[PDB]
Amino acid sequence: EAPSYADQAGGNELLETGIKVIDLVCPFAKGGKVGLFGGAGVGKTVNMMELIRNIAIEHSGYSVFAGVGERTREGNDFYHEMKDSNVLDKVALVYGQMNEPPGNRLRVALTGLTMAEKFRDEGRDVLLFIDNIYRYTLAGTEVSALLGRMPSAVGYQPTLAEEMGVLQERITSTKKGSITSIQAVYVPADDLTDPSPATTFAHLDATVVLSRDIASLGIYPAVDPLDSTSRQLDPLVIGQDHYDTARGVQYVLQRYKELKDIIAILGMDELSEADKLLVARARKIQRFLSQPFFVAEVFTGSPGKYVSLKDTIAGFKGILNGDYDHLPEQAFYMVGGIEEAVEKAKK
Amino acid sequence: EAPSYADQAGGNELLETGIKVIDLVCPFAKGGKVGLFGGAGVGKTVNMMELIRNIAIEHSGYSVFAGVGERTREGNDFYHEMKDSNVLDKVALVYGQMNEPPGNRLRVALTGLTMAEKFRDEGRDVLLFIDNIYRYTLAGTEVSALLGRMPSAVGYQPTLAEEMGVLQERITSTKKGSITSIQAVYVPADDLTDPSPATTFAHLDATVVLSRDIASLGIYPAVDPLDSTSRQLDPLVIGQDHYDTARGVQYVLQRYKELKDIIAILGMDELSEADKLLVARARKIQRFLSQPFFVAEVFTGSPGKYVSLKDTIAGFKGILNGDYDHLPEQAFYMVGGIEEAVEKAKK
Amino acid sequence: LNPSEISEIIKGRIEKLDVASQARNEGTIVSVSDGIVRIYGLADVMYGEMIEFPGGVYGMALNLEQDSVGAVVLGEYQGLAEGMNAKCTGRILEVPVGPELLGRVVDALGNPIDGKGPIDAKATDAVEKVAPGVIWRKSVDQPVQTGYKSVDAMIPVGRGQRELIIGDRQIGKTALAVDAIINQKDSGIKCVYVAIGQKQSTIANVVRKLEENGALANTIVVAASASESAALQYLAPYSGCTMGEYFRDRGEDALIVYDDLSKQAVAYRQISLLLRRPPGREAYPGDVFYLHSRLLERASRVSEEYVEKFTNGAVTGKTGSLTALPIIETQAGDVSAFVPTNVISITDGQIFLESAMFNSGIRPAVNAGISVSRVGGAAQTKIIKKLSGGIRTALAQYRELAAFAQFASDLDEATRKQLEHGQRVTELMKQKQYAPMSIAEMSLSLYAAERGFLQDVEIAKVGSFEQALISYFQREHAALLAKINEKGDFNDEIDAGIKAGIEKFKATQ
Amino acid sequence: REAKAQAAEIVEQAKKRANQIVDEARDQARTEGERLKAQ
Amino acid sequence: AGQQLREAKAQAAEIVEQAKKRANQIVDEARDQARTEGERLKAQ
Ligand SMILES: Nc1ncnc2c1ncn2[C@@H]1O[C@H](COP(=O)(O)OP(=O)(O)OP(=O)(O)O)[C@@H](O)[C@H]1O
Ligand SMILES: Nc1ncnc2c1ncn2[C@@H]1O[C@H](COP(=O)(O)OP(=O)(O)O)[C@@H](O)[C@H]1O
Ligand SMILES: Nc1ncnc2c1ncn2[C@@H]1O[C@H](COP(=O)(O)OP(=O)(O)O)[C@@H](O)[C@H]1O
Ligand SMILES: [Mg+2]
Ligand SMILES: [Mg+2]
Ligand SMILES: [Mg+2]
Helix, strand or coil, rough: CCCHHHHHHHCCCEEEEHHHHHHHHCCCCCCCCEEEEEECCCHHHHHHHHHHHHCCCCCCEEEEEEEEEHHHHHHHHHHHHHCCCHHHHHEEEEEEEECCHHHHHHHHHHHHHHHHHHHHCCCEEEEEEEECHHHHHHHHHHCCCCCCCCCHHHHHCCHHHHHHHHHCCCCCCCCCEEEEEEEEEEEECCCCCCCHHHHHHCCCCEEEECCCCCCCCCCCCCCCCCCCEEECCCCCCCCCCHHHHEEEEEHHHHHHHHHHHHHHHHHHCCCCCCHHHHHHHHHHHHHHHHCHHHHHHHHHHCCCCCCCCEEEEEEEHHHHHCCCCCCCHHHHHCCCHHHHHHHHCCC | CCCHHEECCCCCCCECCHHHHHHHHHEEEEEEEEEECCCCCCHHHHHHHHHHHHHHHCCCCCCCEEEEEECCHHHHHHHHHHCCCCCCCHEEEEECCCCCCCHHHHHHHHHHHHHHHHHHHHHCCEEEEEEECCHHHHHHHHHHCCCCCCCCCCHHEEEEEEEEHHHHCCCCCEEEEEEEEEEEEECCCHHCCCCHHHHHHCCCCEEEEHHHHHHHHHCCEEECCCEEEEECCHHHHHHHHHHHHHHHHHHHHHHHHHHHHHHHHHHHHHHHHHHHHHHHHHHHHHHHCCCCCCCCHHHHHHCCCCCHHHHHHHHHHHHHHHHCCCCCCCCCCCCHHHHHHHHHHCC | CCCCCHHHHHHHHHHHHCCCCCCCCCEEEEEEECCCEEEEEECCCCCCCCEEEEECCCEEEEECCCCCCCEEEECCCCCCCCCCCEEEEEECEEECCCCCHCCEEEEEEECCCCCCCCCCCCCCCEEECCCCCCHHHHCCCCCCCCCCCCHHCCCCCCCCECEEECCCCCCHHHHHHHHHHHHCCCCCCEEEEEEEEECCCCHHHHHHHHHHCCCHEEEEEEEEEECCCCCHHHHHHHHHHHHHHHCCCCEEEEEEECCHHHHHHHHHHHHHHHHHCCCCCCCCCCCHHHHHHHHCCCCCCCCCCHHHHHCCCCCCCCEEEEEEEEECCCEEEEEHHHHHHHCCCCCCCCEECHHHHHCCCCCCCCCCCCCCCCCCCHHHHHHHHHCCCCCHHHHHHHHHHHHHHHCCCCCCHHHHHHHHHHHHHHHHHCCCCCCCHHHHHHHHHHHHHCHHHHHHHCCCHHHHHHHHHHHHHHCCCCHHHHHHCCCCCCCHHHHHHHHHHHHHHHHHH | HHHHHHHHHHHHHHHHHHHHHHHHHHHHHHHHHHHHHCC | CHHHHHHHHHHHHHHHHHHHHHHHHHHHHHHHHHCCCCHHHHHH
């Protein structure tokens, strides 16, 4: 059974991730629920591995990593990575990959959660990682018709919202102890309106959205600042300076989305003097969201960069106020903090 | 059963049709399979009757014609035409037209093919013509629910691909003799992604795709160079001169198709000096692909034209090189060989 | 035409006849419909077990209902009838395995269809198996050269990786996979080509092209043509996978091509609907994801400890691998379909082929923005890893820049430099069919582009410049190409050697 | 005289390239002899 | 000086094109002889 209404926690302690876009528009909190939404090939596992590196290693509590419907190669690379990093003594690893029967993939999430609940109920602070929670829903769809259940919309099981609620309500922080959780959520055919992704948003505190259109432009991490959000993005929780910077970035990118289609048919010269300047800042902001990760060196070739909350805020305020209007657009692409962008412009 | 894997024939001998678009981008081969794809009233029967007229010039053997689910009047017209022309003593005719019950329409294809297989197995080179292969599959859809089978996508029988493969694999050339086969393929509601047309493409050596958009402009035959293709369109089969001419025509038509939306909103005058020249050549190529047929004379009055492969390559190569940049765009419409475009421009 | 020999061959079957009595479990055929047979009485039949029918016809048990057994026929079913006896063999579906299959064409059950005699293999193995677990694997860090610079530079494939080839009809999906098989004739990697639902003349043409290019002696061809039973088309990928796994488990490397997993899914949908199992998202079975995930998770790299344990110490200090190249067909570019959505979510990368690029004359037609490899630089040699770093994302940004700056007035040097370079790399990525390039040939081509040597060359001359440069280095620098081709190594000596040769080439030819 | 020397070297390199093409064609035609066993 | 370089370069291209044209004759004549001998042996 899920913890009762009287057992629910109320903490708002901000958690730093070291990733520019996430720390700006999607601030996380200790004991909260995070979801990494995205289609196929946009970075869910890579962002989860960077978050495990920047949180799990430094943390002094216990962790649980659950590989649900994952590739067996990713599980081997992660095991050797935790073992070689000397972190393995802090983690319980549960694996149910794609080569396993529907009954296994339908219950591995409950096994990993049962181990995390034992640690929470002992009064500990715990980290729970789930590489793909969509695979629990799919195993129910694969077996639903053989269990004698009539199908619902888009071919999903009629029990889609209850089977998801029975699992998601147990993944919570209580008055006894806390569970901080990061889940990767697959989006069928990149459609966020599909019943499975659509039913998942209401269960999470922080929603990070990865876009295929940004990934198709070589920009990484491929996060969408307009669709992504967090319960912690409030001036009464963080501060007015952070909030104004985040809303400022969003305003500039939202206005650019309507001008992109204008420039492609009538050209850049037909825009106003204020619009031409804003478009240049939007294209620069869009590039300064990028950052090379330590777990992505095998894909990028360049080294990995960790950026801090204050560094992130200062860099975006500088581009918004016009302190870097003279720098070329290519100088902000893949460069950690704002200093390195000033240096890349000289190369 | 179909002939075995060890009985297969590796023929690549080119077959000239005398029709410019087909001989340029869809070269046929002796002992191979051809398919004519198209919606209602676009040219499948007219383009087949013109091919029956042109291939019988060089072919000296027997022919087999299977009428599967089409008009009874067209079977009467074809029988009397061959009887009056004295061509009838070398053709076997089988009919199961639209007036017939489902069982007849479902098995007529097998009856005609059984006669063609007798002549192939006697060591002869025969032609096998099918009025519409889609009707064999459709007759199967009308009966499928009555046979107690669960339906598949868009109401089709679950056995769609197997019913098609069991018939299609028998229509082949072997080490004993050869079968050159030509089939008309109806495209339901103009949708090329429909399960029946989609499943047929893999069974053919040459695919000729007809378009309602092209037929609407006045161009006949209404073939689409960008969607139509052949296994014989290879430098090792047709030589580099033909191959480069065909590739050059497709490159120009593809680039013209990309500019359609810009030209529709802003007109041709806004294009670059390079795009303006390419669009002018694309319009001439598109018109030079048209050709008056000896079976279409009744519709318009114009006399039919037979164009050799040599004349076809020379005309399109000249238009690509720019040798005809001075002649007016209407001089290429309905003129057979390239020299007739020069005489038409004098008016 | 040897007498006595034929007799002794027959005497060998008469001598070994099973003259003793056998205890068997049996049933009776109740109904025969669309390749599906229903039986009563098979109490000990196991799921997926082979059923023996009169005249050597075989079936497979798929529905073990309380009162009936639903079986699918592994061949022609029209000869079966009500009242015939159905027998039970205590064996799971098995196929022959070993090096004796190399250079042969076989059916989905391993029977020869090439007419080149019997296959003297000395080992059979089960068609349905579970892949080696998490602890037995090893990270992918060895290359599989396809011979195409666009693929080998931007979307690299490693030994034990699974790379999807996806696009629409008639745009080079088979050409890319067959050229990748041809390039392995000297690599030491064994090949398997699985043809599902293709016409027999298309299969015969692929085999003729493998033979003409000298690649057939290193390839196993598994055929399940369009006229064969939906059960054989459904089983063919698993039979071919089992033949490839023989090399992996013995410390050797193999490559497998599934020419159409979308045709295997259509065959599985037919059987499932005829067995009356309830349909899903496009009438497809509920477990259509598990159909492909159970197949594709076998393609892997296994550790030295796994090979040492499998061979009982006969092979030591060697890893084994099976690399897969599955193919998928889309309808008018629609990736939202159920089967394409499933397979893109299982493989270690994908190669998207685009019809607009193919019609525009970019013939390998690889969309660099949508295509990606999840192994990246670990699957490349030192020289290609350094010379290709960032090319994929640079081309993705060039395609966007070319569309954004299409109608605008003259821009800055940073914009002109990026645009002029992207146009040259775009023209360089073009290659012909049946013409693979070695590590040294691809390296010279990559070096001349990324080190700026193409800046003075016209776009319409990039192909002629590359062909002449390769032909010149082949005559005047043969010892350098032989050094680069040993392991794809790179250092200041090789870098300076290539620089001196390209400078002398442009300054004198 | 420099133009005479460069023109001589341009034709010399062309004749060297032509010789390479014909020798590779002789090795291809010699290897194409696999047909003595194949078929 | 420029004119003779352009003339020599034009002849250089023609010399290489004639070599490519010659290579195809050498290869296709070997194919027809080898296939003909294969049929000679097959009939016997
Ligand atoms: N690199 C290339 N250069 C030139 N032409 C090419 C190239 N690659 C493929 N083609 C040609 O384009 C066509 C591609 O056919 P192919 O069978 O490989 O595509 P496909 O997607 O597998 O088609 P299908 O759907 O029928 O199976 C063939 O005519 C082939 O010769
Ligand atoms: N931050 C990143 N930097 C560079 N490349 C990346 C990054 N994130 C993803 N990629 C590329 O995209 C691929 C897909 O990422 P992955 O996390 O496996 O996707 P998903 O789990 O969403 O299917 C990676 O293998 C890599 O090639
Ligand atoms: N080559 C052509 N020239 C002129 N009109 C044509 C031509 N082909 C078709 N048409 C017109 O289109 C009509 C329908 O053609 P038809 O071949 O009967 O179509 P389908 O068999 O595809 O339904 C003809 O009656 C005629 O009016
Ligand atoms: Mg993932
Ligand atoms: Mg008609
Ligand atoms: Mg293909």
